[PDB]
Design a protein around this ligand. Sequence first.
Ligand code: GTP
Ligand code: G1I
Lengths: 58, 329, 242, 287
Amino acid sequence: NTASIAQARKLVEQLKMEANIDRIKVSKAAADLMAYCEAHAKEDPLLTPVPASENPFR
Amino acid sequence: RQEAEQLKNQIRDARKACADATLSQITNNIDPVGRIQMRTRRTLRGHLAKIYAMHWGTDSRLLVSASQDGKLIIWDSYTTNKVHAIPLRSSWVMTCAYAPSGNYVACGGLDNICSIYNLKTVRVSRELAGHTGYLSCCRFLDDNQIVTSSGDTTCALWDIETGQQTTTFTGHTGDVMSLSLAPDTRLFVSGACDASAKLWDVREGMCRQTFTGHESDINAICFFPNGNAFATGSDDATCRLFDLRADQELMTYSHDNIICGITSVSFSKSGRLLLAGYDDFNCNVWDALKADRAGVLAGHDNRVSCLGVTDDGMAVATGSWDSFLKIWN
Amino acid sequence: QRNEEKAQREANKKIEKQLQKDKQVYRATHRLLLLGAGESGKSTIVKQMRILHGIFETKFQVDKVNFHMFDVGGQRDERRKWIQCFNDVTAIIFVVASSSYNMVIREDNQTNRLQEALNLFKSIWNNRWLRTISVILFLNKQDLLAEKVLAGKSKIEDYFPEFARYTTPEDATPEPGEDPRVTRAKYFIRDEFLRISTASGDGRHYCYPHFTCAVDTENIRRVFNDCRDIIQRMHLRQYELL
Amino acid sequence: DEVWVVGMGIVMSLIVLAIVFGNVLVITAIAKFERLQTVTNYFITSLACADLVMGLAVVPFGAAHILTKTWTFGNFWCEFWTSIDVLCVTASIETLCVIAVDRYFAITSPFKYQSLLTKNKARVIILMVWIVSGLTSFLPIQMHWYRATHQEAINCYAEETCCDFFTNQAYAIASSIVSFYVPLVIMVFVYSRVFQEAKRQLQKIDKSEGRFHEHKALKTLGIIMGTFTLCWLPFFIVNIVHVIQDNLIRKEVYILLNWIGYVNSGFNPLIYCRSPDFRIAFQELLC
Ligand SMILES: Nc1nc2c(ncn2[C@@H]2O[C@H](COP(=O)(O)OP(=O)(O)OP(=O)(O)O)[C@@H](O)[C@H]2O)c(=O)[nH]1
Ligand SMILES: CN[C@@H]1CCc2c(ccc(O)c2O)[C@H]1O
């Protein structure tokens, strides 16, 4: 099967392309997620119940 | 062609080399948000058959839903009264979408055709064909181009004006079931039935990364508001949180008392709460940064198949096989 | 904004009326699902019925009762993820080629073609989402099976070793002129499926075996009778009486 | 003596309660959940409402009258109480007949069941049944067409202390025919047809797949028919007998059989509400 060679090479070129990516430590990613969540924590009605005056479904 | 294992081993070693610490270690002194109680505010009726999908409007006021009766109904959440009702040619529909500009509505299903509608004229505008399998999801990237995912292990980026495929994404092995667009509409992800997810490029049209943390079929996928993470839900009663920059998963959401599958996943505006619908006739509200339950949304008498949160984050709406749409808060 | 509220209330009324009009039509009709193995003759059976009196649809009525049938041939794969959508149908029509007990398929040695059907039927019966759906079974190609069994070149016993220790049922009703070999082959084919059906029936859904060939015009009546029986049995069991 | 009066109060208290509790639970369960709002459940709602009215109105005052041995209210109250009794009793049986006919249509003709029964038609049927029941209770009692013609009857009618049931032949026969004998032959014929269909279906199943593999229908039909027949039969024959020939039945036997009839409202929730959905509803709340 010539087709088999094609898929086998494509799985090799794709894997080579999907291997040379700069990676960062997971601690930095967790810190960034923490910072964003703490930054935008005061603007979501689900987390903090808003007064019934501004609620359109009341 | 025996070098494929070597590259996989190298990728695994590179991923292991950057695992400095677990997310739970960093987020351990945070005071939990505590129990959260939500009550039904509205109940929408009128669907003869059992529902699959829904999509909120961009104004957080209107929403659309599709059912197996062969009918799309555009509701008004504030005054719980209908606006439009569109009969369809084929009664087997599996998806729906709402335009960012509020002018078009798309819906496709078991027939290998994606149809769009012109609300402000209600007649069919164009029919997009070319797929060889059932459609599973579709989203408007803009007012003139749409991205769809079908059951023949492919995705496409259509052009509405000409009705011809522009770019075709290939590389998956199993059926593609769901996708979600980034806030900048420059990248999107997709969850297949081969227990894998991928991060495509809209412009170039080449896959960049592959995550294979799951072990069964993937039914739902969402995307973090920050644009640097996403969450998936599979049939093994687990929700996993991946990260693009680190390139491996960071946290798993599972409980020993639930063994049913997951049908929908969504986030909140702040991203602190993760909402996931189950086959247990109800829904759960996890904690994104702590992996601990925080509430249950009961009230449905059958399977839950839809879920969504408004853009302004004022309410969360669900749709089940009981042919009823409910609005929680 | 008095008109704006009033106008919306005008539209909701126009729809609700349309929905009420359409509900009766939706509830009146009956839906069936057509399914079977490849190279078995489902297309021949469907095309023949109308002249007699990615998806496909068919409309037909018997005794002023509306019936509707959907067949899916575009989505042909071993894994069937779309089958969850068909848990509210009245019945499932299953068609299998009864004469192909000696033929490998796909240029793949595979298994004798009848066995693959058996595996498909077993998977369909034990599905989680089809716990309360009956099955109508059509054993097609009755003449080719009889001729092939009459020929001594191909023997059923070789491919299925359990045929050697098989004895015909005492309640059989062979057609006039039928040789014992044809009757034994037919009833072995029938009870091979009946065993799988009755193993885990649980009393909620049954099976209706049938024999048919090309020259037959009574299938449209058999489907009607089977659907009526299915609904009657469902109603009887609902009231804790059967 | 002293013990008998004490015994009656306890026995009466247990019945008045059970009767109210069963109907209240059924009505609350059917109203709370939308899964149980089936069209065939409307007849059950009407039956439960009728039983609730009977248990709340006629049982307590009847017990008070039988215990006190003297009516303590006016003649108009006596007539109104008799009217309520007759209305509830005659409206608690035609609903059973309607339920039987509905099951007959559901089983015998499965294809035409959807068209023959609609939510709009159920309200019309229920209203017609209630109108017919009210026509034979208030109309011939508020008007004085049911009165008797012997000295004891007129003496009791003049007095304001005795409230006893005296009637002539015509009203007794007509009310008995309207209430009991007409809705009995219909039920018998319907259930015979249903049993025949069930036996035929089971025979077909046994013929089809007997080799690899009778009394449930008998048990269910026996419960449904026997409970009602045993509860309401003797009264609706002594009613004719005592007026056809006098000085044959003592009043105590009359009252005892009539009160035996009242217990029938204490079994309907246990008979017509045994579906698993009702069990789930009962477990969800008040538990
Ligand atoms: N002798 C005989 N041949 C039959 C019969 N039914 C179908 N055939 C033959 O089967 C062929 C037609 O089958 P089709 O209906 O086209 O097959 P199909 O159902 O589309 O097959 P798949 O889509 O692969 O499942 C012809 O060669 C027919 O002569 C039958 O009852 N007797
Ligand atoms: C005193 N109690 C009454 C008397 C006669 C009567 C009853 C019930 C139904 C009828 O059709 C009747 O005629 C009894 O409940």
